[PDB]
Design a protein around this ligand. Structure first.
Ligand SMILES: C=C(C(=O)O)[C@@H](C)[C@H]1O[B-](O)(O)c2ccccc21
Ligand SMILES: [Zn+2]
Ligand SMILES: [Zn+2]
Length: 231
């Protein structure tokens, strides 16, 4: 079954096959005295792999590359970071030193620079306005609007009906808000609606942290964000 936070030592990385040529990667990290799991995606791209998000830090991301080589044996040639925070760009330098072409939107690149986080080298154009979508190899990238962060992207894999929401989507077990210092609470439910409207066909939805589900994860996140807004 899908690996949970309690089953993954910090420093180790697990892969979970969703579909032909589609996996999530799962890692864990301490933050503020608690241990969190964290998800990203791996999508096969001919005889190469596209990586979505690092494994939250240099050590984990090196383990992630080692696990991919062991379990899959295809080269990661490009990676996309879905926003500027350390669980999505922490490890970009590891990726770059391994020869991976790292990408993020100009918004994410500017904010990472401001924050002191690692900065993906390449820039994704065409994603600066809410509702914008661009094809990137075997995925579509979508900018739904400000939500968990002003730059957050979601990623859809049309071949597998997989929607990766990143930190803009919460798992069901999370009934209170995560970090919101960088969020746009006022716009977050509207951005989720844009996701629903653009990817109504999605079958497997992956939050930034925790267990995947279906499109009900978008309603769940809306419920939680609105409850937080009101308290
Ligand atoms: C679940 C989270 C959230 O929803 O905030 C947190 C714990 C996770 O997400 B994040 O991109 O904000 C981040 C940054 C740096 C460390 C950890 C995180
Ligand atoms: Zn974040
Ligand atoms: Zn996160």
């Amino acid at each position: 079954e899908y690996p949970t936070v309690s089953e993954i030592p910090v420093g180790e990385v697990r892969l979970y096959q969703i579909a032909d040529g589609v996996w999530s990667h799962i890692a864990t990290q301490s933050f503020d005295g608690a241990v969190y799991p964290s998800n990203g995606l791996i999508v096969r791209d001919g005889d190469e792999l596209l990586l979505i998000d690092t494994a939250w830090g240099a050590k984990n991301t090196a383990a992630l590359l080692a696990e991919i080589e062991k379990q899959i044996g295809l080269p990661v040639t490009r990676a996309v970071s879905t926003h500027f925070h350390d669980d999505r760009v922490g490890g970009v330098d590891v990726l770059r030193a391994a020869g991976v072409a790292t990408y993020a939107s100009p918004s994410t690149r500017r904010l990472a620079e401001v924050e002191g986080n690692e900065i993906p080298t390449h820039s994704l154009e065409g994603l600066s306005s809410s509702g914008d979508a661009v094809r990137f190899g075997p995925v579509e990238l979508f900018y739904p609007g400000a939500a968990h962060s002003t730059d957050n992207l979601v990623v859809y894999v049309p071949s597998a009906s997989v929607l990766y929401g990143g930190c803009a989507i919460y798992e069901l077990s999370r009934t209170s808000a995560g970090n919101v210092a960088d969020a746009d609470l006022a716009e977050w439910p509207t951005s989720i609606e844009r996701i629903q409207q653009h990817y109504p066909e999605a079958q497997f939805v992956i939050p930034g942290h925790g267990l995947p589900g279906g499109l009900d994860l978008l309603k769940h996140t809306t419920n939680v964000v609105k409850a937080h807004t009101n308290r």
